[PDB]
Structure 1
Amino acid sequence: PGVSVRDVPAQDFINAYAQFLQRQGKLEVPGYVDIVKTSAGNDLPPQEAETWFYKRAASIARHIYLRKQVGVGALNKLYGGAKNRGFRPHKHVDASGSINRKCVQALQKIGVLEISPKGGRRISENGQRDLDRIAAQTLEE
C-alpha cells in the first residue's frame, strides 16, 4: 500500500509542508507580507508574521490537490470569513485577491501547480510527486 495526501491529517500536514517550504527557501515571497491583512473583513494582520505566507501556500497547494481547476476568485471565498460590521449584522467577505493570486503564481513558479485548461489551476505532474512524499515524512512519528 502507498501513501496519499488524503491519508494525512489536514491540520498537521500543512504545518509540516509549511516548515519544509521555508527551509528550502525557493518560494518567492512578496515584499508586503509584513504589512497586509489576509482579508478586508479581517481587522489585524496574521500573528505568525515571518511564516504565515508559507503556511498559507501549503494550504493552497493541498487544497488544489484535492480538486480540479480551482480559480483565484474561489480561493478568496474559501479563506474569507465573517466581517465585524459594527452595529450591522455579520456577513461573509472574501479574502485578499493579490495574496492568493501571488501565492499561486509563486507556487506555479516553484513547480508544484500549473494553469489547467478550461480555467483554474491544476496541480502539476511533479506536484503530485512531491506532495505525496511530504505525506510519508508526516506519518513516520
Structure 2
Amino acid sequence: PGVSVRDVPAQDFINNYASFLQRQGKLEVPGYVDIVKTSAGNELPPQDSEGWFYKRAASVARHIYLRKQVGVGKLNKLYGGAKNRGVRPHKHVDASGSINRKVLQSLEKLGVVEISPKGGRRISDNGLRDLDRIAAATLEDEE
C-alpha cells in the first residue's frame, strides 16, 4: 500500500502537528509572541493566546512540504489579507515581517526546514520523516 501525506484534510494535520510540538517542548519561543498583531491587518492577536503560533508554524511547514523554494515575502503575502480601513475600501497588506522569519528560524533549529539554493527554503529529511509520521498518526485517528 502507501501512507499518504497530502491526503489529510488540512486542519486535522495542523492540529496533529501542534499537538506533537506541545508534547516535544522543543521549538524555542520567539519571545514577541502575544505582544504582537501577527498580521498588519489585525486589531486582535491570536484569540487563544498561548498556542496558535504553533498552529501557524505547522501550517507553514505543510506549505513548505507542498511546494518548492519558498521564502519570507511569500509567507507574508499568504498570511496577509483584508484591512479594515474605515471610510476607505480594503487593500491587501501582508503579515508581520519578523514573526514569520522567527518561525522559519525555529523550524530550521528543530530540523524540519532546510535552506535551499536559488533563494528560499525546503524540507529537511528528518523533518520529512516527522511529517510522514504525523500524517500516519492522523490517518490512524481517522481509521
TM class, shorter-length: over 0.9
- Give 1:17 deviation, angstroms: 0.5
* Matched position secondary structure for 1:32: coil
Name the aligned partner's letter for residue 10 of structure 2: A
Per the alignment, residue 134 of structure 2 pairs with 134
Runs of 4+ in 1 over 2 A off after TM superposition: none
Per the alignment, residue 12 of structure 1 pairs with 12
- Give 1:109 deviation, angstroms: 0.5
- Give 1:13 deviation, angstroms: 0.6
In the alignment of these two chains, the number of paired residues is: 141
Unaligned ranges ≥5, structure 2: none
* Matched position secondary structure for 1:18: helix
Per the alignment, residue 111 of structure 1 pairs with 111
Q: Aligned partners of 2:113, 2:2: CA distance in 1, in Å?
A: 22
Per the alignment, residue 84 of structure 2 pairs with 84
Deviations 1:72-93 (A, max 9, x none): 1100000101000010001111
Q: How does 1:23-102 map to 2 (within 5 A)?
A: 23-102=23-102
Unaligned ranges ≥5, structure 1: none
- Give 1:34 deviation, angstroms: 2.0
% same residue: 87
* Matched position secondary structure for 1:14: helix
Root-mean-square deviation (CA, aligned residues, Å) is 0.9
- Give 1:2 deviation, angstroms: 1.6
